[PDB]
DNA sequence: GCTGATGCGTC
DNA sequence: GTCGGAC
DNA sequence: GTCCGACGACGCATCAGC
């Protein structure tokens, strides 16, 4: 009877089936879930938010199965499997032409409002068909992804609107939010996995209805009863590392549980995992503090793309990214290429590598920026500009054997023993085991000068397995321009501002910088900047720069196809900004014509480090200094 | 038949 | 990709 | 240290507008 705009999952004593506000059977209103998502947002404690998710799915659970999957995408503003590529093609643009057709208001009006508040469920909702359904709400969303060709954006709009003409209470709030992209729960893979396993273990699937067991924590204590959780969320967790698709983990988890899922799910070439990541590290010395008595291995890290190849039993070869993403298509150059990279004994693997933009002409490393320059797909290999060569550092897989749980001294052994080096084409990352640290620092210069960002540093034999699910960042980066005073640092002159959105609501959230060009005593826009400020800084700089706005830009500035400020500023403020290196810009206009006649420079990964009081904007980093920067680089 | 805006992936 | 904040 | 969501440049692919 309970109307699920009363529905409160934060409840103490939750009760799956009591507690739900909808009967057994019944598909789970959409408003069910956008209460959930209150409740969530109200608290930031991510365990409160756990058990809160984990409230609902209970219910789920208990009352209806099918709804589950949809449910859990919904919650992590997913479409489906990252493998399978669907894509929604909504943007701002697109969602407040339907938010503005729904509501009867004009397009500009709308479009104020939601830059303002930096939201755009706000606007939506502050503005019969039967209730919205989850699984209803999320069929819609996979109906305006499919939708493709020409007119195919009016399609996806009306599809939107009558979503929103069919929300109630918070609803279009919320669906307005996901569109977008930006659900901003505070809640994530990682806590929405703690809450499924939380669910299912309280409340077991399968059960005749009405399930007999709806808290199998009550008959123990706290202790234990937080000892059993965690152990059950390894489980999931430890699954989805190494299978990371709940279309196929739910029907498993659903038809024999959570502590039977493993036996059904696991690691098999032609699925991607998720790959070890790195932890950022600001020096040599705090690499051996953090590794302390461990062995270790330093290798180059090369300035490419993450390339995840699976060769399977039979032939057939996928390749995937950092991401899951399926790049099959992309690289027809590597999947011929693999016969001659595997021993004749080798019948499977999953390979870890880097693919680095290769000039064959020249035999060197290319930049990132050429290697972006490939097709997504491309049919024929002949057709292909750009060469890659593999750099190999790692081996999950060999021979119908996961190598997860080996440490990285005998995955690199099986590596180097049943994988062959081709010049060029195929090689294994280079490596230095050393525990000296003026080894490690020539090291270290060595990468940069063969064109690489710095170390990876890996421990050979002491938490050196390849278990995601037990430390998802168990390798450390110590790239050149962690360190201080290396990397280029320019100190660059805040000519706009933009509105924040988000956690950067009522606030400016990134910045227009400029440097100075000296020959026409004109600042010429050279990047954005929107990290590296306290929020205390940050909130500084939202007072101090709303002095400076202007209602037009001054005549010397310069931004060309920049992003417009929604406030210019008067060029007074100077900052000291760090880059990982320069890029060629089609868009800045700043140095455009002193390397290159068409494009200006910009900053890779621009993030503040302080404010230059003693410097006015004719002191700032000049564009001759950007140009001669850019060329020590292409050396 | 072409061009520019832009979604979304890479880093 | 970099970064800061709450836990 | 984990987890999450603020924010960056830049490229291909796609599609609206012409
Ligand atoms: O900065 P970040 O955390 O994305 O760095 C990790 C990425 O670095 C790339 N990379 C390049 N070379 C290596 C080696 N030798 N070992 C491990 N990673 C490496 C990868 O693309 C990785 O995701």
């Given at each position: 009877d309970m109307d699920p705009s009363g529905?409160?999952?934060?409840?103490?004593?939750?009760?799956?089936?009591?507690?739900?506000?909808w009967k057994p059977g019944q598909k789970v209103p959409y408003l069910a879930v956008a209460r959930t998502f209150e409740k969530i947002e109200e608290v930031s404690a991510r365990l409160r938010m756990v058990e809160t998710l984990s409230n609902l799915l209970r219910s789920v659970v208990a009352?209806?199965?099918?709804d589950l999957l949809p449910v859990l995408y919904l919650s992590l503003n997913?479409?489906?499997?990252?493998?399978?590529?669907?894509?929604?093609?909504?943007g701002d643009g697109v969602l407040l032409k339907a938010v503005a057709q729904a509501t009867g208001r004009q397009l500009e009006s709308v479009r104020a409002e939601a830059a303002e508040k930096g939201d755009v469920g706000l606007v939506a909702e502050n503005s019969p068909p039967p209730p919205l359904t989850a699984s209803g709400v999320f069929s819609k969303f996979r109906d305006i992804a499919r939708l493709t060709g020409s007119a195919s954006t009016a399609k996806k709009i009306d599809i939107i609107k009558g979503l929103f003409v069919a929300c109630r209470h918070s609803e279009a709030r919320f669906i307005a939010r996901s569109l977008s992209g930006r659900?901003?729960?505070?809640?994530?893979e990682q806590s929405v996995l703690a809450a499924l396993s939380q669910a299912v273990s309280l409340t077991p699937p399968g059960?005749?209805?009405?399930?007999?067991?709806?808290?199998?924590?009550?008959?123990?204590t706290a202790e234990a009863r937080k000892t059993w959780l965690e152990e059950q969320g390894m489980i999931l967790k430890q699954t989805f590392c190494e299978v990371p698709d709940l279309d196929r983990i739910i029907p498993v988890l659903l038809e024999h549980g959570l502590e039977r899922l493993p036996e059904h799910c696991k690691l098999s070439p032609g699925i991607p995992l998720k790959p070890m990541l790195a932890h950022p590290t600001r020096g040599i010395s705090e690499v051996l503090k953090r590794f302390e008595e461990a062995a270790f291995t330093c290798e180059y890290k090369y300035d490419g793309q993450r390339a995840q190849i699976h060769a399977l039993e039979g032939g057939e070869v996928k390749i995937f990214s950092r991401?899951?993403?399926?790049?099959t298509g992309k690289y027809p150059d590597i999947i011929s290429r693999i016969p001659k990279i595997?021993?004749?004994?080798?019948?499977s693997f999953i390979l870890d590598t880097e693919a680095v933009a290769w000039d064959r002409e020249k035999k060197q490393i290319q930049p990132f920026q050429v290697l972006t320059?490939?097709?997504?797909?491309?049919?024929?290999?002949?057709?292909?500009?750009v060469q890659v060569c593999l750099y190999a550092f790692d081996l999950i897989y060999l021979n119908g054997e996961s190598?997860?749980?080996?440490?990285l001294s005998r995955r690199r052994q099986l590596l180097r023993e049943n994988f062959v080096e081709t010049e060029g084409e195929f090689v294994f990352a280079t490596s230095l085991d050393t525990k000296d640290i003026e080894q490690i620092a020539e090291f270290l210069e060595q990468s940069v000068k063969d064109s690489c960002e710095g170390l990876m540093v890996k421990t050979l034999?002491?938490?050196?397995?390849?278990?995601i699910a037990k430390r998802s960042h168990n390798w450390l980066k110590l790239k050149?321009?962690?360190?201080?005073?290396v990397g280029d640092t320019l100190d660059l002159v805040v000519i706009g501002a933009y509105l924040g959105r988000g956690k950067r609501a009522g606030r400016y959230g990134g910045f227009l910088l400029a440097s100075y060009d000296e020959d026409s005593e004109e600042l010429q826009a050279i990047c954005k900047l929107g990290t590296g400020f306290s929020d205390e800084e940050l909130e500084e700089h939202h007072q101090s720069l709303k002095a400076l706005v202007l209602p037009s830009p001054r005549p010397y500035v310069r931004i060309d196809?920049?992003?417009?400020?929604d406030h210019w500023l008067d060029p007074s403020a100077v900052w000291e900004v760090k880059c990982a290196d320069l890029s060629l810009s089609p868009?800045?206009?700043?140095?455009?014509?002193?390397?290159?006649?068409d494009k200006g420079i910009s900053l890779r990964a621009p993030r503040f480090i302080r404010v230059?009081?003693?410097?006015?904007p004719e002191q700032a980093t000049t564009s001759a200094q950007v140009a001669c920067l850019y060329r020590k680089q292409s050396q």
């Amino acid at each position: 009877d309970m109307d699920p705009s009363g529905y409160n999952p934060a409840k103490n004593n939750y009760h799956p089936v009591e507690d739900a506000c909808w009967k057994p059977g019944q598909k789970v209103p959409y408003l069910a879930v956008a209460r959930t998502f209150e409740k969530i947002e109200e608290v930031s404690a991510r365990l409160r938010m756990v058990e809160t998710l984990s409230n609902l799915l209970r219910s789920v659970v208990a009352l209806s199965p099918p709804d589950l999957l949809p449910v859990l995408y919904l919650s992590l503003n997913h479409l489906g499997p990252p493998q399978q590529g669907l894509e929604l093609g909504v943007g701002d643009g697109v969602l407040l032409k339907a938010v503005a057709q729904a509501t009867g208001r004009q397009l500009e009006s709308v479009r104020a409002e939601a830059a303002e508040k930096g939201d755009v469920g706000l606007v939506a909702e502050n503005s019969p068909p039967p209730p919205l359904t989850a699984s209803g709400v999320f069929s819609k969303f996979r109906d305006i992804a499919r939708l493709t060709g020409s007119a195919s954006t009016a399609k996806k709009i009306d599809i939107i609107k009558g979503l929103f003409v069919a929300c109630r209470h918070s609803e279009a709030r919320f669906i307005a939010r996901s569109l977008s992209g930006r659900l901003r729960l505070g809640l994530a893979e990682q806590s929405v996995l703690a809450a499924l396993s939380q669910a299912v273990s309280l409340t077991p699937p399968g059960q005749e209805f009405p399930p007999a067991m709806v808290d199998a924590g009550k008959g123990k204590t706290a202790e234990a009863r937080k000892t059993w959780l965690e152990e059950q969320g390894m489980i999931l967790k430890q699954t989805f590392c190494e299978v990371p698709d709940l279309d196929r983990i739910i029907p498993v988890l659903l038809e024999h549980g959570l502590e039977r899922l493993p036996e059904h799910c696991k690691l098999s070439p032609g699925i991607p995992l998720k790959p070890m990541l790195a932890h950022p590290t600001r020096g040599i010395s705090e690499v051996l503090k953090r590794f302390e008595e461990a062995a270790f291995t330093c290798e180059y890290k090369y300035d490419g793309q993450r390339a995840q190849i699976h060769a399977l039993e039979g032939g057939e070869v996928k390749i995937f990214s950092r991401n899951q993403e399926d790049n099959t298509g992309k690289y027809p150059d590597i999947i011929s290429r693999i016969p001659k990279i595997k021993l004749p004994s080798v019948t499977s693997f999953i390979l870890d590598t880097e693919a680095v933009a290769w000039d064959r002409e020249k035999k060197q490393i290319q930049p990132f920026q050429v290697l972006t320059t490939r097709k997504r797909k491309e049919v024929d290999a002949s057709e292909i500009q750009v060469q890659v060569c593999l750099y190999a550092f790692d081996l999950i897989y060999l021979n119908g054997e996961s190598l997860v749980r080996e440490p990285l001294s005998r995955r690199r052994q099986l590596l180097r023993e049943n994988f062959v080096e081709t010049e060029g084409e195929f090689v294994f990352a280079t490596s230095l085991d050393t525990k000296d640290i003026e080894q490690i620092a020539e090291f270290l210069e060595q990468s940069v000068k063969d064109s690489c960002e710095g170390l990876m540093v890996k421990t050979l034999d002491v938490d050196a397995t390849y278990e995601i699910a037990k430390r998802s960042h168990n390798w450390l980066k110590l790239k050149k321009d962690y360190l201080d005073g290396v990397g280029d640092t320019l100190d660059l002159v805040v000519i706009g501002a933009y509105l924040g959105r988000g956690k950067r609501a009522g606030r400016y959230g990134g910045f227009l910088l400029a440097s100075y060009d000296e020959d026409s005593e004109e600042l010429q826009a050279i990047c954005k900047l929107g990290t590296g400020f306290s929020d205390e800084e940050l909130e500084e700089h939202h007072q101090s720069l709303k002095a400076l706005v202007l209602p037009s830009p001054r005549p010397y500035v310069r931004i060309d196809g920049a992003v417009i400020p929604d406030h210019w500023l008067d060029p007074s403020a100077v900052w000291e900004v760090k880059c990982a290196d320069l890029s060629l810009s089609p868009i800045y206009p700043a140095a455009r014509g002193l390397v290159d006649s068409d494009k200006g420079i910009s900053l890779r990964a621009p993030r503040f480090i302080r404010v230059r009081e003693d410097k006015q904007p004719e002191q700032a980093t000049t564009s001759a200094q950007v140009a001669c920067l850019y060329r020590k680089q292409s050396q």
